[PDB]
Amino acid sequence: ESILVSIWQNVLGIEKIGIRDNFYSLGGDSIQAIQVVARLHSYQLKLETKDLLNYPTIEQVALFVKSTTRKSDQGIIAGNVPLTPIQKWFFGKNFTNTGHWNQSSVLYRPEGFDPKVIQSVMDKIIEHHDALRMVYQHENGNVVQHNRGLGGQLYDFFSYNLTAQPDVQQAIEAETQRLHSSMNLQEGPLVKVALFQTLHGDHLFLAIHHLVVDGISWRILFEDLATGYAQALAGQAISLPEKTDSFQSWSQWLQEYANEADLLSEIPYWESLESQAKNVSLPKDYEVTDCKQKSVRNMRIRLHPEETEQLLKHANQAYQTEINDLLLAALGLAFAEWSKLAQIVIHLEGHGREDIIEQANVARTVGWFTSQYPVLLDLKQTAPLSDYIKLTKENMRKIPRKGIGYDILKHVTLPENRGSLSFRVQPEVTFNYLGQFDADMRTELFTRSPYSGGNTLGADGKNNLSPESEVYTALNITGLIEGGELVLTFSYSSEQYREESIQQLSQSYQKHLLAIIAHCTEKKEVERTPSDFSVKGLQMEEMDDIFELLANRL
Amino acid sequence: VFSKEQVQDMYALTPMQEGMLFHALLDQEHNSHLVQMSISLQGDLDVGLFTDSLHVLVERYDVFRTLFLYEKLKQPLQVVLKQRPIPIEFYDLSACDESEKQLRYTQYKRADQERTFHLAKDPLMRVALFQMSQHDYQVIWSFHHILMDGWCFSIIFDDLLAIYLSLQNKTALSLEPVQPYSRFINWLEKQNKQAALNYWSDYLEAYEQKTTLPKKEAAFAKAFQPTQYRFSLNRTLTKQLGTIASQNQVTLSTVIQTIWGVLLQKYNAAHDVLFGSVVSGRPTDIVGIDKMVGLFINTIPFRVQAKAGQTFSELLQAVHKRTLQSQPYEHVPLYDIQTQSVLKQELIDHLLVIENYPLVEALQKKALNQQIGFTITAVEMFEPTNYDLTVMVMPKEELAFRFDYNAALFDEQVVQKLAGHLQQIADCVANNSGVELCQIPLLTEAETSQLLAKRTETAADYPAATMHELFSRQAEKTPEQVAVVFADQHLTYRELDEKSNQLARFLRKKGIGTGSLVGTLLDRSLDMIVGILGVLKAGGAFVPIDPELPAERIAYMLTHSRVPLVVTQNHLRAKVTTPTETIDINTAVIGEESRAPIESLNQPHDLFYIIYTSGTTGQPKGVMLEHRNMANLMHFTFDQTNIAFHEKVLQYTTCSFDVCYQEIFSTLLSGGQLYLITNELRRHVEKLFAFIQEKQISILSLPVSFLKFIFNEQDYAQSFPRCVKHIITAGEQLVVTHELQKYLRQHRVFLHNHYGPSETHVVTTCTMDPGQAIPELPPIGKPISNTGIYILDEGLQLKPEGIVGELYISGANVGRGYLHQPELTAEKFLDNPYQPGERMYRTGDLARWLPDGQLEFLGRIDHQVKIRGHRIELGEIESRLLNHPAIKEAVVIDRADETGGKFLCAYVVLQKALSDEEMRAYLAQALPEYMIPSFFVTLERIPVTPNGKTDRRALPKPEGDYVAPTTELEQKLVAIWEQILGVSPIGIQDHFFTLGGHSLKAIQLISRIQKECQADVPLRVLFEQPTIQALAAYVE
Ligand SMILES: *P(=O)(O)OCC(C)(C)[C@@H](O)C(=O)NCCNC(=O)Cc1ccc(C2=C3CC[C@@H](OC(=O)NCCNC(=O)CCNC(=O)[C@H](O)C(C)(C)COP(*)(=O)O)CCC[C@H]3C(C)=NN2)cc1
Ligand SMILES: Nc1ncnc2c1ncn2[C@@H]1O[C@H](COP(=O)(O)O)[C@@H](O)[C@H]1O
């Protein structure tokens, strides 16, 4: 390539270098190679000098020139998509009426939301993001995903005027309740859209089957919708950001990664977990083994805005925890008081996307990446609160790759690789902490409809899971910040637990979380723990030795 | 006071910092580990802003605020502090005497080079400023090696000047973010360790014998004294090497490394040599690593190996490819690479370092790039240096070399010559790229002419008459005297002459003469000397045979000789089963021959004498001397030996071996008297010494086995004769026992040691010992008149004094060749390459010139044992065994297992029974564990050939190491050993590095000790005595 010739000329100094002259014959060395590569990368081309030396001719090294950044395939893509771990989990959980398992929101726009504009935007949205096209065929009694092309019928659309009814909220609620029943997973759009007109402005309902979307994917979809509507209002060509690596390729690289020995290196950790979790259990107010979503009840507890700001700004520093570490330590103490169990296991939803494949960028990728892993919280030594928060901090750091590996081993690694793993601990309890709501209210061009209804993104959403679906987890605990306050939601099945026992559990949570926020804000020093320092396998028994030796030496 | 707030970070040490922490903990004769950049600045310099800029430089780089903590840890750590100011001493001397100022400055600068950093307790930099005038400042900036590669200083000084400029111009710092050394640590933990150890174990695989350079002296003391020498190649020779490199597709560093390779080959025997190469160790895979301040510089083994037919270009290609294949793995620490090798340590003992950019010049150009008020006017550097030798090369305009060397170990003449040879190699390589490695000469004209002068010196002019003509001209001098006595019967010289004339006149009637040869299968008698001399006067060559030989071997020798005629006694006529005429020497017709002198009818040039050697051929082969060969020896023996003339000589060597005829002609032509002795009496030392003393014999000649052994036969050695004045010996590597020492010292017998292939003569060099002082392994001495002697390599090239090579022998002693199987002759016999017109014989011996001009013998080229990387002189182990009071006679051999794995074993005969350890300890007093024999075999008698040489064939095959007992007393160290080593239960006398320990696990060991107990022990202890029992001196 001419660029590479030009670098050789203006680095080796010799002019007129031929297309296959020899780097060592021209007088290169371990330094002229560095000068070539450093110069070359200015053109965004990359070349390890190992290749420049080993293939010391222009004609031979050019076969190893690369672009520094990959261009992710922005084309239209289609075809077979392997199940990801969470999709395989979904089909393996085998709900009744799987065609009604959704996420949604209701948007609002005071000045109106003209149907043709939002239609054109959703069209471009579904042209752009491929995974929203998939269908799930139940071929041969197994399941396979087909990523459809642009063969029309991207999404179902509906439009309504509610001004004839005074109680517009009830009408829009009942209609969105209707739409949730209509996901033809084998053949049809997985995105449903409805627009409700009203004198106070237009309301826009989005609903999407959960198999193809996620909270991060909703933040993306909203800000892309905002920029798309800005383009449509400006009348310019709707032109979304550069497509990041499409979910098909993520599924492929994951299936490839799922059999690498790298993941299997985690296997002794998850074994050391499961071999200890063997006798994990959770009590029930009544002996029952299945429930339906209509049996689920939820209740909320709040901290005051002052305590929420203290938790957000000051409670972390005293231990270099992050927010998750404190909420989860409080959950540990809550169960330690309420259950009086020696141990408990909690399942957490990571956002996935854990940089598992170095060439994979998914920052703009719509899909269901939610990655589930169990964690065992120790409850035996709750007395020294100074240490319980340290212990919980460290266990959260021992989890490899923040837990993306475990459900690959459960669902995708070929079963000879996955060793002794039993996979027979189940999510009786789960905890998650969302960010702020600001993923929804991210922009002023439109906002959350005051008639939001039961159609929230969160597990407090009423309509988005079908009333006949089975309750897959007994306690679902989610935290979020709104109005400047932390809101905790506890979900339970009315047939497994009664109201008084969840009022107990939720107060025994609020108590210990306020205790922890006070304790850690009052502590004015900073302490640190072995995970802070960058010494592999350093321990409390050793870090406080090193800090003893320094204090003695100096 | 300390607070936990202050620590920024911790790390495990990188392999380089691990190695340098070990090094810094090892030594305490000095702890000079340091660098002292010393920079002279003229002009205007605001010392306040300089101070500030140094404080901002120490804040900028985390590696300058690093401290290394190891005192009690499982594993050394870097601890990085958030704040740690460095000392900045300042001394305004501008008001001081020019006579004082330079002294005060020099005294300080030299004192600072002595001020050792404490790797934990002190900041690892200093700066000092001396203001010498209104516009003159000198900076001293000592720092520790462990902080950074010294060349990193070019970065640090650039940042420092940028900071100073920013402060002077009140302008924001433009410096980029620091490329953090932790970025490389991550990459070191990402990399697969075992793939690289499994490569380096392959690279070293066949490394049979360690490289050497001629160290002057043993480590009698750590008299280390850092010394230097430097030189450079001419402009043209350098750009010629550049042309070679650019034509061969290799770097100039590869050409330089190959030239140093070929040099180390020619300086050794080997075709396979390994030395340390120092490489930047910065993996190009890292982003920005060429700006990363830290410790990267690494030592790798570099191996150059050649085929015999390989051109230098073909070695260039091979060493280039071997370098590229190594590059992915050059970050591995040498302490682990050494563990991959059968040389578990001492794999490398000198370095070749190539540096395209020295720090001076590079630094000396910097401040010229900035408008600041001062100019850096000079710079110096100082670096205490590890190795005994280090060849720096700077590929400057004139390719310049420098040998940093410890002059306590290399003589300046050794290094001066080494640089001469290194230039002569480079010139040969530079003129023809395609010369064979065998054909490159090391020697300049000044050495070539000086060695060849040893042929032209000790030339001598002699009458070169025929051997029987010399006898006749002697016999006319004193014919009436008794020449020979056998049993109790004697002949005069007259009677010997008359009988020889009679027998020669008779033998000529059988056609014997110039075209003819005679077999002389005669047993010892007066008739034997008469027989020889008569056959000589018959003018044909005489072919003696030992009656004690196998009849099949006798018949082989006869038929292969094509001998028509055999002379014997009557009883031997049955031995001659061959179709050959057999003459009774007693036949009365010989009494009728005319007794007056027979005419001399063959000439000194013609064939004379033939005997049959052993060898690698299953057939014995006959080597034939010409008369000129013995005549040349006789005149030298008269001219230049202390052997007395009118003297009585014991004949001992049997007629099958040429020293017999060294006895015979040397006795007769000196006019002495041959005392013959009956064949078997050689078996009866109690009768030999009785005869010698009762006959008052004045001269003896003894095989080497007689000297080694019979003087330890205490009852007889304490009864040894004292009438003897001179002893002659030859045939085997001579060894003098402590008993033989005491006897020679008391009796002051002149011992003469002679050497020769027999294919010339078993004398062609000699030395002689007045009994005043005697080495344990005497040399084989000087060449002799009209003998040329050369130590050559496989190319027939001369090789320098002090280097080993093939001992070619030349001049008047060189025989005609082989009587039959003459097709072998052209392999062994050739013209002297350096001087046509002289014959030369290719001895299979190695030898070395000693600087005093004596010649050293090194055994056969086939037997260079090179056990487990090391060469061994078996004579040293033999010396130690033979000087044991219990051992009478002993031998050592390179045996091998039935897989072909060589091992040392000893064959021994003793005055008492004793345990294996009762001699093994007696060796361990002095001999390294690569050269103590693995097994000891007890025998009744060592097999000897009647020539007296030991026989490797007749000793029995062996039957059936460091292994040691678990003689536990306290397990504490054993538990420490077991937990660190993990590989085995540990013997209390067992060896840490033999157990697979290495330099760094030794520090892990001691750091464990000094926490698991309130104990300490200097690291050198674990290298002086690498055993658990070594710490018995330290537990209390
Ligand atoms: P291209 O090939 O040109 O290279 C790329 C560039 C960009 C040029 C890059 O390399 C660069 O910028 N250049 C850097 C400088 N020049 C070079 O090219 C490389 C170079 C480095 C250093 C020098 C000089 C040296 C050599 C450095 C030191 O060498 C030395 O003796 N080693 C340190 C001593 N420490 C040890 O203990 C040895 C290593 N550890 C061991 O394995 C020991 O054997 C143990 C510890 C005993 C093992 O324990 P146990 O298991 O046995 C110091 C010597 C001399 C210096 C000096 C003064 N001059 N330069 C030159 C070039
Ligand atoms: N005095 C001696 N010292 C050392 N080696 C000798 C001596 N005499 C003979 N040899 C060696 O033995 C071989 C010749 O043996 P021979 O021809 O039987 O004397 C050659 O390898 C010689 O180098």
Curated annotation (Swiss-Prot), chain A:
It is an enzyme of class 5 (isomerase). The gene is tycA. Belongs to the ATP-dependent AMP-binding enzyme family. The modification O-(pantetheine 4'-phosphoryl)serine is found at S30. Tyrocidine is a mixture of four cyclic decapeptides, tyrocidine A (D-Phe-Pro-Phe-D-Phe-Asn-Gln-Tyr-Val-Orn-Leu), B, C, and D, in which Phe, at positions 3, 4, and Tyr residues are gradually replaced by Trp, depending on the relative concentrations of these amino acids in the growth medium. Pathway: Antibiotic biosynthesis; tyrocidine biosynthesis. Large multienzyme complex of TycA, TycB and TycC. It comes from the Bacteria. This is Tyrocidine synthase 1. One of its GO terms (biological process) is lipid biosynthetic process. The lineage of its organism: Bacteria, Bacillati, Bacillota, Bacilli, Bacillales. One of its GO terms (molecular function) is ligase activity. One-module-bearing peptide synthase with a C-terminal epimerization domain. Each module incorporates one amino acid into the peptide product and can be further subdivided into domains responsible for substrate adenylation, thiolation, condensation (not for the initiation module), and epimerization (optional), and N methylation (optional). Transmembrane segments: none annotated. Keywords: Antibiotic biosynthesis, ATP-binding, Isomerase, Ligase, Multifunctional enzyme, Nucleotide-binding, Phosphopantetheine, Phosphoprotein. It comes from Brevibacillus parabrevis.
Curated annotation (Swiss-Prot), chain B:
Residues 464-1036 are annotated as: Domain 1 (Proline-activating). It comes from the Bacteria. The modification O-(pantetheine 4'-phosphoryl)serine is found at S999. Residues 964-1036 form the Carrier domain. Tyrocidine is a mixture of four cyclic decapeptides, tyrocidine A (D-Phe-Pro-Phe-D-Phe-Asn-Gln-Tyr-Val-Orn-Leu), B, C, and D, in which Phe, at positions 3, 4, and Tyr residues are gradually replaced by Trp, depending on the relative concentrations of these amino acids in the growth medium. Large multienzyme complex of TycA, TycB and TycC. Activates the second to fourth amino acids in tyrocidine (in tyrocidine A, Pro, Phe, and D-Phe) and epimerizes the last one. Belongs to the ATP-dependent AMP-binding enzyme family. Consists of three modules, including a C-terminal epimerization domain. Each module incorporates one amino acid into the peptide product and can be further subdivided into domains responsible for substrate adenylation, thiolation, condensation (not for the initiation module), and epimerization (optional), and N methylation (optional). This is Tyrocidine synthase 2.
